[PDB]
Every structure is written in C-alpha cells, then in structure tokens.
Tab-separated table of C-alpha atoms in Angstrom:
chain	number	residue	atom	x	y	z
J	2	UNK	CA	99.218	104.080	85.156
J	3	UNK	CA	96.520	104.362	87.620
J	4	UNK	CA	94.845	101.896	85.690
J	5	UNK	CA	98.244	99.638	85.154
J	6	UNK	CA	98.772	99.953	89.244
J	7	UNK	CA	95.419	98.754	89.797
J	8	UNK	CA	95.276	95.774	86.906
J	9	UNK	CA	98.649	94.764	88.335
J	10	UNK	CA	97.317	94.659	91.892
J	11	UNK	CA	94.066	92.934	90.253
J	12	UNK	CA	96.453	90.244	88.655
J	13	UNK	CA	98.371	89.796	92.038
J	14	UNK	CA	95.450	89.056	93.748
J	15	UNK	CA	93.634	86.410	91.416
J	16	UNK	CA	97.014	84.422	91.846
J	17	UNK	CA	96.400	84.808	95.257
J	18	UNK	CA	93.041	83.093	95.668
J	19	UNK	CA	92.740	80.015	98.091
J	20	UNK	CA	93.146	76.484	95.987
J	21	UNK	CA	90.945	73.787	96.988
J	22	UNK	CA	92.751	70.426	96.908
J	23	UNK	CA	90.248	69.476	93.647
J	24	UNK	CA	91.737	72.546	92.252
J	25	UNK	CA	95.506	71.594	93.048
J	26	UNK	CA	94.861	67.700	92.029
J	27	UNK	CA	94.519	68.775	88.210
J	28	UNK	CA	97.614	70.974	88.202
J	29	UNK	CA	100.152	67.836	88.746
J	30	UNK	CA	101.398	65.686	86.534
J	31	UNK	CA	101.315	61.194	87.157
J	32	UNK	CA	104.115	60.305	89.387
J	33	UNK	CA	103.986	62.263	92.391
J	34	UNK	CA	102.627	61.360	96.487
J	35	UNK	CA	101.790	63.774	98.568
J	36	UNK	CA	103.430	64.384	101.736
L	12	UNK	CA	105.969	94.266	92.606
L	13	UNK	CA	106.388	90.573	90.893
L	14	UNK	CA	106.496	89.330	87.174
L	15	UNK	CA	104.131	87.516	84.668
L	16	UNK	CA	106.089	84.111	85.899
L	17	UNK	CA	106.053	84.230	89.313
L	18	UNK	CA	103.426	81.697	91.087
L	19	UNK	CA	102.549	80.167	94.303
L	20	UNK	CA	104.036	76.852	93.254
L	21	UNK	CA	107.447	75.766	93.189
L	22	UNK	CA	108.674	72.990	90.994
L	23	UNK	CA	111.993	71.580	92.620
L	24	UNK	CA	114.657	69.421	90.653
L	25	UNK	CA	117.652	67.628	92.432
L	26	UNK	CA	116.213	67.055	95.527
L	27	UNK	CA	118.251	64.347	97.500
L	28	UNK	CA	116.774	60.882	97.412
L	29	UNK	CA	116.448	60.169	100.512
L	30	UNK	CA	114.973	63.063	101.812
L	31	UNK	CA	112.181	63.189	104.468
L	32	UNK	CA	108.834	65.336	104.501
L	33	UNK	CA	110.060	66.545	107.622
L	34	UNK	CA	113.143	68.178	106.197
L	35	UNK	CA	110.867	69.343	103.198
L	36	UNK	CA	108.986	71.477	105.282
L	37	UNK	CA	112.087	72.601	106.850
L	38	UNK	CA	113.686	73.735	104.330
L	39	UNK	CA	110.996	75.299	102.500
L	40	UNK	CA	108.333	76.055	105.269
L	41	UNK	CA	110.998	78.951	106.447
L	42	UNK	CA	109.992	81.659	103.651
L	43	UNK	CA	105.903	80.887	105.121
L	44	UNK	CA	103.218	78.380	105.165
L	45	UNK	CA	102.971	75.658	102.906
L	46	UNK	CA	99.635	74.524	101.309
L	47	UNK	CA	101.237	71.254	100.221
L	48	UNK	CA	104.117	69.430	98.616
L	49	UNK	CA	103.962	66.974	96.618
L	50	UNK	CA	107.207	64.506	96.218
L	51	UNK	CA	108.639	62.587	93.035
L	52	UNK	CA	108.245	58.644	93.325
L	53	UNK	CA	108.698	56.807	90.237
L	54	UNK	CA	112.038	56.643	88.400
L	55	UNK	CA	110.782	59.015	85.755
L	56	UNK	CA	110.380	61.653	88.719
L	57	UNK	CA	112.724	60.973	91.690
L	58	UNK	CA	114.622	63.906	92.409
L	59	UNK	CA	111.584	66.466	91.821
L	60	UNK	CA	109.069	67.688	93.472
L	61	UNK	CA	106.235	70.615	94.191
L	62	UNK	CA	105.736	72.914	97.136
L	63	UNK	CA	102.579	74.818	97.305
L	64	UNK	CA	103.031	77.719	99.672
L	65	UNK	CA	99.774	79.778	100.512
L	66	UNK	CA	101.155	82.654	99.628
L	67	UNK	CA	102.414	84.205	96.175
L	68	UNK	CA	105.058	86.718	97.928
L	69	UNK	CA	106.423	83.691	100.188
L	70	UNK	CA	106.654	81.591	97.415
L	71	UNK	CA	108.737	84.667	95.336
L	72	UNK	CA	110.800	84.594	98.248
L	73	UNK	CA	111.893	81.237	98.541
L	74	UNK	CA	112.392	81.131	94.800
L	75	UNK	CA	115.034	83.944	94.827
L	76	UNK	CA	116.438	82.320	98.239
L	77	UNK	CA	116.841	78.619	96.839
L	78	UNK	CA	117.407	78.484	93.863
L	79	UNK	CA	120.891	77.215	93.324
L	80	UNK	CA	120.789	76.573	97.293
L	81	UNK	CA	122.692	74.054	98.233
L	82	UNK	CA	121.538	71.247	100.410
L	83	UNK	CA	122.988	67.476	100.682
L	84	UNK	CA	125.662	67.736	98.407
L	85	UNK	CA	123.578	69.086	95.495
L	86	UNK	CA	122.691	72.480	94.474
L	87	UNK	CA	118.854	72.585	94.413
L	88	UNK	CA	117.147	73.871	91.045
L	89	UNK	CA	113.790	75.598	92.099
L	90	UNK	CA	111.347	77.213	89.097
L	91	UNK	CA	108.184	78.841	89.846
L	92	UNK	CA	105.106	76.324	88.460
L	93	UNK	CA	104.206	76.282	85.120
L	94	UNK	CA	101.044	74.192	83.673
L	95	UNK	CA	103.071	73.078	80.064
L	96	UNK	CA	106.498	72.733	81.614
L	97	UNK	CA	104.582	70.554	84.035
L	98	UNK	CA	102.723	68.477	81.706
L	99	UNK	CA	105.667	68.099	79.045
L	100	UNK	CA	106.138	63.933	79.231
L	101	UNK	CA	102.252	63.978	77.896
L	102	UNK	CA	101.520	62.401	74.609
L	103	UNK	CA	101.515	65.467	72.524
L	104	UNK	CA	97.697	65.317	71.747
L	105	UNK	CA	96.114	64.734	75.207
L	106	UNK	CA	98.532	67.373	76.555
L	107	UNK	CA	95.880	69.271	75.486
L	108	UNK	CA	92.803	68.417	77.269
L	109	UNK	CA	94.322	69.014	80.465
L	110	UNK	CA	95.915	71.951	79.050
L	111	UNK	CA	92.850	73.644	78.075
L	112	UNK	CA	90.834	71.789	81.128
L	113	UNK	CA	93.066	73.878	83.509
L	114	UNK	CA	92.582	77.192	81.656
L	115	UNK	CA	89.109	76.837	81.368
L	116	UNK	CA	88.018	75.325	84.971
L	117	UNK	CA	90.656	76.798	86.904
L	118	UNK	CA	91.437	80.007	84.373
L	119	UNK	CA	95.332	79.030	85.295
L	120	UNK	CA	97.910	80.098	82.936
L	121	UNK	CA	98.292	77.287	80.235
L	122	UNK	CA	101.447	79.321	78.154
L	123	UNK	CA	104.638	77.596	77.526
L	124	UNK	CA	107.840	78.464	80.102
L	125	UNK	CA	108.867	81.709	77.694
C-alpha cells in the first residue's frame, strides 16, 4: 500500500488546494449572501 | 486519515433565524480559520447556510464536533459539501451544466450524496 498511502495523501492534498473566490462563487447554489 | 466525503465545506441546516455573522464565526471559527460563510436569505433557504474553512482537517473536525450540536434551542444539522446535494432545487436539465461546469473547471466532485 505504498502506493495506496501515497494516492491517499495525493487525494488529501488536491482537496486541500487554496480556492479563489471565482472558484467558490460556482460551488453555491441562488439564495445565499455572504457574510 | 479521512473518507471519500469529507470536504472543506460545511453545509449547515437549522441555523437560528436570527443569528449574527458574529456568532457564525464563533461558533464555527473555533475548530480553525474560516475562508468564508455564506448565509441562507430567501424563504426557500433561511435556516441554512455554508462555512468554508481553509482547512480540510478543521473542517473534519467541526463536522464530528457539531453535528447534532445544539445551539439556540435547536440541534444544528452540519454535512460536509456536496456539489448535487447542493444544486438539488435545479431544474433537472440545467442541473447539469453547472454540474459538469464544476467537474470540468474546478475538477470538484460532481457524485450524488451516496
């Protein structure tokens, strides 16, 4: 699983990436302000 | 460390009406820096919101932490983001554009909540 540890620390990381507000803006739904 | 599910964004249900963004941050700034929250303000959404935290293992945190936490006299419901829970009261067909805009600009997770 050297390649599953690694992979899994690979996945971790991608969903740890800064977001740029452009980024964020597309993930919400109508409806919401932000505070 | 932390399942397929588990994201940096937190979508809150029962939050108390009248609830300030200073006690947002409160609450949920604790478990580590937040990127952002955004608040429910038409009658469709009152009562929800999102909290962006700028970290993935903060955000796991608070999730196990508040979920079911009360506050007010309600017991918060807290679920990690999800792009098709998120985009559910879409008309079925343009659902879809943003769906696959998302996966394709952003390469974010488009799957249903299974």
């Amino acid at each position: 699983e050297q390649l599953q540890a690694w992979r899994w620390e690979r996945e971790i990381d991608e969903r740890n990436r800064p977001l740029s507000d452009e980024e964020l803006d597309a993930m919400f739904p109508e409806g919401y302000k932000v505070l | 460390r932390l399942p397929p599910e588990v994201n940096r964004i937190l979508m809150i249900r029962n939050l108390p009406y009248k609830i300030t963004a200073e006690e947002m941050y409160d609450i949920f700034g604790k478990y580590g820096p937040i990127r952002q929250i955004r608040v429910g303000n038409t009658p469709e959404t009152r009562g929800t919101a999102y909290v962006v935290y700028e970290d993935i293992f903060d955000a796991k945190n608070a999730c196990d932490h508040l979920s079911g936490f009360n506050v007010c006299n309600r017991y918060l419901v807290v679920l990690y983001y999800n792009a098709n829970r998120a985009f559910q009261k879409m008309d079925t067909k343009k659902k879809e554009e943003q769906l696959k805009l998302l996966k394709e600009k952003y390469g974010i997770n488009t799957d249903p909540p299974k």
